[PDB]
């Protein structure tokens, strides 16, 4: 719910497909401000309906996985009783069966248009998701877990998402999804007895009025150590879900650099040259 001005978006071909797909559903209104730098997203609290136009996703793998679950939330319209998700030849060969399986088990009606098991699919609209317990094999892509997590607050009953049959190998991306959900007002909790079962409350995100890559952000901060200047990265701090956000306090701080780290800002300051401390 509400209008959010999104800043510092990565503009690639894959995120553009996500933009135009999102804007394609009736209910989400996307525009650009500040000469294209800011993306303005006015959500309407999950009240999406079919536009009758298929969602072409190119070969945007992650987008196809996230939007397949979004599509399972969509309501019917005079345009169509279905949402169609398509892509290019390589998309129509990528497997998505683990996600389709889980959604089907939760009441979704999904048909593979041509290649069964490995292709962007079609979803019956007006069903929503039943909620309750949803199992996924722990061995699958974390993107399948993230995809279900983000739409789970919109199920008809609170969701328990249980990862079974082992341990996931990319837990950090599941944690990132969970942390971003919290910033948008929904807190995922974990089972006390199962490390990879997630309890997602039923509710609606509240969009902040405003909302980088920390690994590549290390190079301007590391530049500031070798002449002694000040460089600041304005969207990563201690609260950042990424793993390389600790780089200012863990390695640059014991090197003899004095750090203005807030929860969003990250500013380093170097000593004069020839005085850096060996760790």
Swiss-Prot record:
It comes from Candida albicans (strain SC5314 / ATCC MYA-2876) (Yeast). The AROM polypeptide catalyzes 5 consecutive enzymatic reactions in prechorismate polyaromatic amino acid biosynthesis. In the N-terminal section; belongs to the sugar phosphate cyclases superfamily. Dehydroquinate synthase family. Residues 1-279 are annotated as: EPSP synthase. Homodimer. This is Pentafunctional AROM polypeptide. It comes from the Eukaryota. The chain holds residues 424 to 705 of 1551 of the full protein. The lineage of its organism: Eukaryota, Fungi, Dikarya, Ascomycota, Saccharomycotina. It is found in: Cytoplasm.
């Amino acid at each position: 719910n509400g209008t959010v001005r999104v800043k510092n978006l990565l503009h690639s071909d894959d995120t553009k497909h996500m933009l135009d797909a999102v804007a394609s559903l009736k209910g989400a209104e996307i525009s650009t401000e500040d000469n294209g730098e800011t993306i303005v997203v006015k959500g309407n609290g999950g009240n999406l309906v079919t536009s009758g136009e298929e969602l072409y996703l190119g070969n945007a793998g992650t987008a196809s996985r996230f939007l397949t679950t979004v599509a399972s939330l969509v309501g019917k319209s005079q345009a169509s009783d279905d949402v169609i998700l398509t892509g290019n030849a390589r998309m129509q060969e990528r497997p998505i069966g683990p996600l389709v399986d889980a959604l089907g088990s939760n009441g979704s009606e999904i048909e593979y248009l041509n290649k069964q098991g490995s292709l962007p699919l079609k979803i019956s609209a007006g069903n929503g998701l039943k909620g309750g317990r949803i199992e996924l094999a722990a061995t699958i892509s974390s993107q399948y877990v993230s995809s279900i997590l983000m739409c789970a607050p919109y199920a008809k009953e609170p969701v328990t998402l249980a990862l079974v049959g082992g341990k996931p190998i990319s837990q950090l991306y599941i944690d990132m999804t969970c942390a971003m959900m919290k910033s948008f007002g929904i807190e995922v909790t974990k089972s006390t007895t199962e490390e990879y079962t997630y309890h997602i409350p039923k509710g609606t995100y509240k969009n902040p009025s405003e909302y980088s890559d920390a690994s590549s952000a290390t190079y301007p901060l590391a530049f500031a150590a070798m002449t002694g200047t000040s460089c600041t990265i304005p969207n990563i701090g201690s609260s950042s879900l990424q793993g390389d956000a600790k780089f200012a306090v863990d390695v640059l701080k014991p090197m003899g650099c004095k750090v203005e780290q807030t929860t969003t800002s990250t500013t380093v300051t170097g000593p004069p040259r020839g005085h850096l401390k060996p760790l």
